[model samples]
Target chain A: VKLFRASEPILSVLMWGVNHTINELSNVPVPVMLMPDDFKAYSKIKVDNHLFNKENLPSRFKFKEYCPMVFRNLRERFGIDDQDYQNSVTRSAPINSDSQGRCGTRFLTTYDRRFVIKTVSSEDVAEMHNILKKYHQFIVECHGNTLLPQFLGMYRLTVDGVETYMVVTRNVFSHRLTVHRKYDLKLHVGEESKKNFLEKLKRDVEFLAQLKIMDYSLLVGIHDVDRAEQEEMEVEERALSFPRFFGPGEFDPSVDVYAMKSHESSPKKEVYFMAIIDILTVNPEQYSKRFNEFMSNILT
Target chain B: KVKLFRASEPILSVLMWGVNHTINELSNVPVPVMLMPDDFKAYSKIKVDNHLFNKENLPSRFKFKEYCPMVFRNLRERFGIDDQDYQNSVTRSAPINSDSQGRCGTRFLTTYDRRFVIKTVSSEDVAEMHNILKKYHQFIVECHGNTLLPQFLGMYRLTVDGVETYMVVTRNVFSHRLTVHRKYDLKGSDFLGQKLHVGEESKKNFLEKLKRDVEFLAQLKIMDYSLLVGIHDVDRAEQEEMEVEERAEDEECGEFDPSVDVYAMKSHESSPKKEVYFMAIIDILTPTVNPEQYSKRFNEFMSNILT
Candidate 1:
């Protein structure tokens, strides 16, 4: 029940708001298809307690969830259950991400690292509203198989009368398997595997170009097989005294949705995760082509 | 993942919300080794104004103020009440309105579980509470939580629609699970038609506690308080329980856990009827006559009324 025990008030509120909205949405039956109004619908809550409940949060703050129906739909497409998402966030306080976003944007990962919460700009929130419909359509068409960032939910939090915009997405790297190295444009394979990877990348880039969405870059994390094996053994030795789960160099694809195995014949034995990130950009056609070309060069 | 604090009235909803919020916040605060002088005067206040936000059952704007939180928290412990348990009773669901009212038109409410009472008090009463709180806490500590005095848990001031309402919370003296068929406000002033038969030994014990409690209040110049006594007929309750069970298949009659039903006492075996009595001293802040004279009169009236 110590749900939102975060160091910062805003983070605690985020955890609280997410837990609340998700529980509320659980009662709402899944619509067969989203309606036009669903995209514009939002839920806002204002909490004011004079001299009460102020330990981990401000007595006064407001939380607004934008297009809840649309986000829930997105979550479903990404194979995320509302309960699991809620648990990942509300189970413990999210830790601050090591890398800060552009222009002082803050980033955080769920305690389990299954999800990422990134602070965005008001302009970015507006951009999301503009493209949410088309983005949902793209996700649906691809059957949640694209290389794009899987946006789960977006929100606006007001604390001390200041407004902040944030977006939640599936973490693009394995939660348990540590990444030893990182590359921006990345990946892979046996001949057929390379063709399949290239094919999906092309189609994803084409969709971004069609929508004039740019400045997006590929986020790649490489987990070295040897390093992971040693780490797992050390972890197991520690676990001998206290128990745990997971195996060396292994991950549940369903849970770590973006992670892919390297080709058996590749030079390095590794696990790779590659997803298109920073999709809130411009100069669509040229940037898309450059992104595709750069990504193709890295794969071999 | 917790109770939503939704209620029919905005004020009740805010109370449920405030209790839930404060209790959760208190969980994070490290319990102090001892209370400080400053703790007696500490308070926390919050003001909320929401625009086009969550307004399903609650008002968008309101204010809540908690007075002397540290003091109440210490008192709760002294009363043998756990902070978490207190929180769950009030916040686990919206407190239902009690049909009872206080002097000067003050309203009353009980937690959904009926484990606690929420009484709306006047600003003057709040001031009086501030005056007696330190001593009251000391008395409870000295008595080791063995007294008929009210178990003050928390005090608050709520502002809704520009109206300020002060409230105080206390452990309900009556059993939460049992029904009280008859009640009496024995101010030492009166009571007799429905006599309670608790036998000689129990009556002596009750008087001993009452005398000590009244004397302490006299020392503080507090008077005009009453001994609130409620009686539950065990046999009558059993019959009513059977009827309810027959109609709705419900349960639990005549029995109470002493820890939970702190003020309950059973009738003597040879008494005219089998009954459970809840007796506690109430309204300890009011004053009149001379304190010593009033307490002596109040104590004597209470001692004579019991069997």
Candidate 2:
């Protein structure tokens, strides 16, 4: 018997839940379009085992997925194959992230760092439900292009009668490259590049404002190319050799959706990742304008 | 790619889905140092209701209950059957329906690879299984898993559309690769004209094991069990294999690994014809009459059928 081999029982259960739910969804027919009922729909499974299969998992636990169809649709819109998403979550146990969410909320990254799992509060879950319909619509209207968190799946796990809620999203930074510098702009580059970044930001913030969402920040990560190259040479020389599916400082746009290279005229050789985070908010129009202006000014 | 769990019938699809589900779940559970008393009576039940989701091959609503999973897991271990292999055999593809039926018109099916047999049993049989499971497991352990009796692997109860079905899984009595030209269900009752040509040494060994196995069953007051004998004519098999190879142009044939073909025994060197025999006691769960007398008769008839 192969164990899930996770650090905690909850993580093992998370791996098990993702694996189970994805496989279950595979049997479902891919609908031509998601229906309104799909938003309110959910799947719940309670496993009660008596002295059986209790190595990595508890003898009993409950896993509930919020809006299965909606999330499945979101995954597809984001260009993520169900099988690949399943493998990323289940191929190995997700590892704990050094960073924690606001209010000491726990955070974990899939073993490959392709995805992030954030522990959320019941209120946050309610807020997600409050905005899910518009969120899905927004992603579709934008052609799956947005600076907002690529919300993937949401779940509720109950162990020992205690309930924990979590939300999954595509990681905003490179999975393999180290982010030597991080900035939380209240935070880009060239006329075409600057206009492209500003245009996307303007439209993204406008949508957020229409939803009355605010207090979101433009989170940014910078990978210095020269430093990374030096580090890679040292590691490679010591290790003798190794391997992406990207070289150092280079990334796949399809995969690293938020990543982009700095323009040649910029001060340093770098890769920049920028995305909207802490999106659950409130602001009529002032916050949106100010937020948009501050983010626009930081680009150059 | 994932397993689709597609089958001709909803019940069959559910079976494939359930085995795959349980096995995957069990993989996450760590093997215990020792099974507890609670393990014998324990079961795992899952009720699934797909709300506008993944309901192609399976029902939107159904329930799967695995009886005494720990005991069955342990039983599988003692039988040298890996859980992964068992899962693959049943879930890798839909099982094929067997031509024959059991008493009470029970349904029979075999894995796509024919490595295991799935038989639909009565609810009463499920109760009987619960009653005899602990002792059966003990008997297996005492024999060091060397018994000639049926190697029970898994038992499940599935509820679909308010109809509940019980099924038991066991290792196939015949070789998975070799074809049986003739078969006999000997209940001390019968056999074909061609006698088994096993050597004196092999015959004696087989009879001794059969006696021990039948006595064990008789002690439990179990009877009506039959010696399921499948005879493979080696020469005929060779010719058929050659024909298949000729037609296919590339394929290995007429070869069997003893470890995999556990019950297979070669015919004697000086026998009238070359053959391979697969023999094991089946139907031990259903008691008919006086087990002691039936066991004696069963042993005598089976011994006489051999060289």
Candidate 3:
């Protein structure tokens, strides 16, 4: 499948917005899939949804969302009067699917283009709108896209005020991709982890991190990439947070210096590492002083 | 003795400065007993005012002190107003209690003085609403012991053209006694009694208005309060992103997993004051009340109660 040449410019424009709006670096290796122009040797999809984040891409957007240009005037965007209330106007209908869950394919030409149109009732629409707005805000501000699918556009509903013909934006389906693996998450569901997860879930987290890679980190926690393979397997059924905490001294040696360490010079290399080490680990004096001055002040 | 004075500051400092001395057993310390951030971990920076900090790039206190109320007042009292009288003249908008309802817990107990609800309706060519307003006021003063409902003194509004505008002044509902000021319909209405004061207050106050203002506030107030809470919570991060979708956590009436249940309202008046009383007969989850059509009954109930 290929995008028509006429739409190439538009696709480019949309891609730019996708990268920047989500705070992604422009140069990150995004192989734009479904080629618009004729290709010579290229056969692979350009857009690799997974594996693009702070490193490959510039440390830009950790997350991002599609915001309709007119959402600033929240009332007018949804055609609600001043009294209509913002929540009473917007809507969020979760798109769920079976075969293709996180990677479920939603077909549509634009925000207005929809193969299957669901005219959400005005009442439900309001609640939906609120969810959408909050979801959008979370992604837009936090650079996090972990809640819902990547927002595309708001399509006008032909069914008077009740119907909206919507199009699928990107790889969000069955609510699985954005939602962390339950068994894995529960393992890291340590008391502290739950607090931060609850206190922190928002849209503005790193776009790529929130919906995709960051979730990978939670998987890392459950898998305990730092632990022995058997131990990780043991915790496979347990829940965990992302960006798993590796054991102390984990990831100490640089991948680049592996050759040197493996060579006869390894002893010298180890010595150099030890020489650079700073032993100021978790200073209680500093913690107590700051904790008293800060946390206690607010708690008091 | 002079060295002792140097050691004196705050208890916290003395504690930290003397931590080693107070340890129960200096040699048998179980752990390092300290925690620090990954200072060695790599990080990069972005431009200031960039999306890096969102709306909080700079210390708000330093950036345009004139925009804030406390700072503005000090300016006025200390220097006085000129043409450049603080480019930012915020009205210190009301607590959104009356207008906002209590959605945003940030809502202040007191309200800021702001715009009055405008009257936009017109009447027969030969008559003036002066008589109607005068009648409304008399009913307000002579009313029974219920002083909690808003005190509707008169009908007032502005008309730029022939368009009529009006609002009957009344006591703020949150303050009036209905605790449902903060509840929204979608959060879950698993009760037979209406928790939101809408249907309740509409019943209590407008019990007199012949189905006019009192009946109308039920629907309007619910919408108003929900929006107030929504707006008041502007930009508050890390809160529920998908609240009221299927179920929510705090203040929700539904379950997270597979579950179901029900309850009553009259039982509340008899039960001990459980702090945050929930469930009203007219809520969405009520079996008999058509959630979609309940707004109309809520309006009618309000007028009957007001009178």
Index of the highest-lDDT prediction: 2
Which of the predicted structures, 1 or 2, would earn the higher TM-score when compared with the native?
Answer: 1
- Computed on C-alphas against the true complex, the DockQ of each candidate is 0.18, 0.40, 0.01
Q: List the candidates ranked by DockQ, beginning with the highest.
A: 2, 1, 3
TM-score quality measure for candidate 1: 0.80
Question: What's the residue-level lDDT of B303 in candidate 3?
Answer: 29
- Return the TM-score for candidate 2, rounded to 2 decimals: 0.79
* Native-to-model Cα distance after best TM-score fit, residue B281 in candidate 1, in Å: 1.4
Model 3: per-residue lDDT, tens digit, B23-56? 2111121222221122112122211111221111
Whose lDDT is higher: candidate 1's or candidate 3's? 1
For residues A172-254, what per-residue lDDT tens digits would candidate 2 score against the true structure? 88887778888776614546656767777888888888888777788888888899988878899786025544655578888
* Model 1 chain A weakest 10-residue run by lDDT: A96-105
- What candidate 3 gets wrong by more than 4 Å, as runs, is A1-300, B1-131, B144-150, B159-168, B176-307
Q: How close is candidate 3 to the true structure, as a TM-score?
A: 0.17
lDDT of each: 0.80, 0.82, 0.24
What DockQ class does candidate 2 belong to?
acceptable
**Candidate 3 per-residue lDDT over residues A75-156, each given as its tens digit:** 2222223222211111112222222122213332322111112222344333335455444445444443132333333332
lDDT of 1 by residue, A131-193 (tens): 899999999988898778889999899999999998998988887777777765425655664
Point to the candidate with the largest TM-score: 1
